[PDB]
Amino acid sequence: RTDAPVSKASTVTGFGRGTNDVHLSGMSRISQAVLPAGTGTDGYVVVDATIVPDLLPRLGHAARIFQRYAVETLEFEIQPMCPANTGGGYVAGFLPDPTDNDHTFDALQATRGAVVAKWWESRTVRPQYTRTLLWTSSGKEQRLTSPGRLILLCVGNNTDVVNVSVLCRWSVRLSVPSLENPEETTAPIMTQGSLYNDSLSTNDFKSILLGSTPLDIAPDGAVFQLDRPLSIDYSLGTGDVDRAVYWHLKKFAGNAGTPAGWFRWGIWDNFNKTFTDGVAYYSDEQPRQILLPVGTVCTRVDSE
Amino acid sequence: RTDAPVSKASTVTGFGRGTNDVHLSGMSRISQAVLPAGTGTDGYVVVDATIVPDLLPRLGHAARIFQRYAVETLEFEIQPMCPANTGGGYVAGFLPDPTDNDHTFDALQATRGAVVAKWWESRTVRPQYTRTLLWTSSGKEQRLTSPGRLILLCVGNNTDVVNVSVLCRWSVRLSVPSLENPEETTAPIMTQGSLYNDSLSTNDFKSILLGSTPLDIAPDGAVFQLDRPLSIDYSLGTGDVDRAVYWHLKKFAGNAGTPAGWFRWGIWDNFNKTFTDGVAYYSDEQPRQILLPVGTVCTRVDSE
Amino acid sequence: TNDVHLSGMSRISQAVLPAGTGTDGYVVVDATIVPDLLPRLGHAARIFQRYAVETLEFEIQPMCPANTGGGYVAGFLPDPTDNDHTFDALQATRGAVVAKWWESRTVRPQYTRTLLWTSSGKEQRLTSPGRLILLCVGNNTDVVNVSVLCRWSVRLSVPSLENPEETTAPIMTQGSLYNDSLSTNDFKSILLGSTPLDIAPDGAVFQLDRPLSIDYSLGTGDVDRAVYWHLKKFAGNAGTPAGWFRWGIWDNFNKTFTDGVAYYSDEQPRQILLPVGTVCTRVDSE
Amino acid sequence: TNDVHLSGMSRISQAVLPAGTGTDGYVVVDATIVPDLLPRLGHAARIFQRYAVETLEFEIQPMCPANTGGGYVAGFLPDPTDNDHTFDALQATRGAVVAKWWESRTVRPQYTRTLLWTSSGKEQRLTSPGRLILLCVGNNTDVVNVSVLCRWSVRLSVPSLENPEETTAPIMTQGSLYNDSLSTNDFKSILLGSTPLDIAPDGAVFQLDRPLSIDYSLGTGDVDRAVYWHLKKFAGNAGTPAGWFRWGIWDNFNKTFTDGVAYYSDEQPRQILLPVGTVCTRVDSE
Ligand SMILES: [Ca+2]
Ligand SMILES: [Ca+2]
Ligand SMILES: [Ca+2]
Ligand SMILES: [Ca+2]
């Protein structure tokens, strides 16, 4: 027998008490290449993979529920498929800084774990990694969301086709409970090539021009966004030179003739999840202009 | 000292040995309503939520890595916010069949756990559930992907605005290791209202017409797909009656005047992730036609 | 007891992937596991309605020269419903293996181990424990003639006589058929995106669970609409390895196909005819 | 030792959400936790560069009549970077609470507990342990004047003198500014989707990390382009509760704003001016 109050009180009991930790692990292919005989000149950077949960598929999904993750174990396997008579050499190693962009044989052998071997032999690279707790959501500083990157370079000239596959065996612990939308979980990518407005087409441009191993082998229909604005020289149609400012790109698949592919600029309307295309570039007697400089950061924004 | 073979052998060691089980749990709001005074007539089905990992947000993400899940514990809390002088009553209960569509007070009280209470009191519904292992990927039979659904009905007429919130406290074990794309993890939805071709507009139609509590409170820009084809009567433009066949819809948000909203038919191009709109419906002296019958299953296909 | 245990080793399937064809990802066998596919068990199943899997292993068995230098990934996906052939999906499964084309390997899956039906039905999670997919991981240098063997043991439960056209696995489309992809009388099998359909022999007949609408004309500038439920496979060759499908009428009594009406395209609006996830049972006898 | 421990209880913020305004989801306080926001700690932080959090709890404290019958959800999100105010996001955090508007509650978060900086910097995961968001869960019947209190203890490490305009939390845009949303001289604050900006007082000045391009004309039918880096908040009222922003020039020496050029729209192609994730620091003194 209790009295009738003005208002009863809340009985929302179990709240805010979600599962906290998960250890989780597996083995994931982190890249695959195929090199035709002539290609594979000394030093050709066959692979460069920045490690982030997202790259390890199974992990990538779990990481959308917690805010931190910390690496407990990593190894990579190299496992090219090729017969004994191939006379080329590779060198792999895990660079513990995810920002480091200089890929030389010399800079890998320097890394702990680094391996060197003729194409017909497999190899295991037991690297050195942070084992501290990084973040699952991408951020401004990369040093905090990734433990480093795995690169593999050619060492001689392959006599024949090389079918390399590079597997990463991982185990990791997810620390903090939270809900992270799949847009923010993507890894940022730095260009290593200047985009001139003399090197253009009316509505697109080459992906090899940007000089980035990820953006080169990036998939189709894939909407990106940039930190730096893109300057498009358009016209009213009186011979008039006007100026347009777009922030977003769209990847189109490449060719056997054009290894890397295209990139159509435009507008990524996020409220409605759609992608408009960008205005007709006005070819003109306009002074030469770098529209996007070396080091432009491109972060994937569309639904994954 | 080993000899040089024709081909060395594979050294892909740790493969196919991923993490297998995860227990995981939390508490999630499963719906929220607000009922203005007049609304809330006896029996008004205020809530009807089919339970699936996806509905429990944190869980929904983990479920994309395993193939089965099995429920270890469930309770729901009811927790309306309203002051003591509101004189209306509700009745909640968890229907252990996810297909059961008859929502009567009588059919809830029948369920184990079911509760009855005036709006100003909170309640906990400790239900009966399968505790067997269901599947995370949606399938043809629903009985196998969901343990049932939680419905809440009005019991009198609310004198005042009712702000109910319904929280589900869950704990579940994910059984089987695998990678499931977010398109297949969505829950299917059955319409409970016939769509006549007399009740139409040139390019859209009402969402209340379908008579489905989910499709009514479904979000904006949300592309669906159907099991049954949709028959659109179009024209060549000579007074000609031609026939068109579309499989896909698009949700547009609703009004204070139109509670539920619109639905624009069309084409969901999945290769490229885009949505074209459907042709101008030809209004004509055409015999009355049910385009989509009661019980049409609508499964969400766009990126989540 | 009334239950019958049966065990054996049997070839699930055999592909030849010729020289140079095939590239990372190329699905070289995609086999939905049901007793019909397992030869000796095939006949045992025709007798009872229900089977349950006791043991399952696949032994991969590829045949090529030692210098072949390609590669494959194999594994067993437990969801006969899951329709995702990517490497990533496979590498996620238990059992999964990777090797060079000259190396046999044994995949050791995990499977339902519960009581399933012999004859096909709506929900195919009760007809099958899963499916095995084997993919290319590189480009194969040589002709490889891969023969995937399955060692199996099972328990068969209630005696029955089973119609053999019913025992077969339903095949699902992976790609949409658009109206603007139809030729006058046929279309390319590859459009449907399905390896089992692409490799189904010449003259296979399939029933669809969704209507195939064919716009046609009398030749008066007048567009009319027809409906069809059956396809006939016309074999693929070097020029068109996927082959072709003609729509038409399957007569179930006489077991004969009659080709349907010609497609007439006349300024029609864009249309989806056969959405992805269209189900295609083999109805013709084998 | 050189390190200084300091503890107190302080009001993080105070909102009034008036009668009938506010609906499930409506963010009523979104406060990025940095020492400036915590009053007494505010001054302590101006002296050292580095602080570390020892204890943190927020006590919610809403004030209304007992018959108010709305509701709120509160919680503390550990990622100053994470920009997601939904209930689902909050309910996922540790500490999270729910109550009727007349009930105080105490959120008990989990936080970084590591060594952070006092002055703002590029990566704001080193300036803050996270942010607290409190949302509506129903429609509030009455005026509620919620005052959220924080009991805190901290360790301050290296002595320093700190510029107070630098100590402030950067605010991030949640919505894009489109060119076709500009008025001649201003635009509506609500377009940027940010509660802290929407409630920033009249006359607040903000610097952007991205250029605001303004197309203008001389009045000859000739379109020209200007660039601006500063905004001034013009206070919101009942008709436009979010208020408005004028672009222009902030003079950092004289601490004065000069309004910029008028926007001229003349058959321009669709453009994104300020994409979502544009960063907006408070530069004007307080
Ligand atoms: Ca985060
Ligand atoms: Ca599945
Ligand atoms: Ca049977
Ligand atoms: Ca400082």
Author numbering:
A (entry chain CN), B (entry chain CN): 34 to 337
C (entry chain BN), D (entry chain BN): 52 to 337
Article passage:
We determine the crystal structure of the T = 3 GNNV-LP using the ab initio method with non-crystallographic symmetry (NCS) averaging and refine the structure to 3.6 Å. The electron density of the icosahedral asymmetric unit (iASU) of the T = 3 GNNV-LP allows modeling of residues 52−338 for subunits A and B, and residues 34−338 for subunit C. The rest of the N-terminal segment of each subunit, which contains N-ARM, the positively charged arginine-rich motif 23RRRANNRRRSN33, is disordered. The ordered N-arm exists along the icosahedral two-fold (I2) interface of the inner surface, and extends its N-terminus to the icosahedral three-fold (I3) axis to form a β-annulus. Three neighboring P-domains per iASU embrace one another at the quasi three-fold (Q3) axes to form 60 protrusions on the particle surface. There are three S-domains per iASU, and they all share the same calcium-binding structures to facilitate subunit-subunit interactions, similar to those seen in the CP of some RNA plant viruses, such as tombusvirus (DxDxxD) and SeMV (DxxD). The flat conformation of the subunit-C/C dimer is stabilized by two ordered N-arms alone, in contrast to alphanodavirus, where incorporation of the encapsidated RNA participates in the T = 3 quaternary organization. This analysis may provide insights into why the flexible linker region allows the entire solid P-domain to be malleable, resulting in the broken electron density of the P-domain with large B-factor values for the T = 3 GNNV-LP.
Here we report protein crystal structures of a piscine betanodavirus, the Grouper nervous necrosis virus (GNNV), in four different forms. The S-domain comprises an eight-stranded anti-parallel β-sandwich with three short α-helices, which is a canonical structural feature similar to other virus CPs. The P-domain folds into an independent structure, including eight anti-parallel β-strands and a short α-helix connected with loops of various lengths.
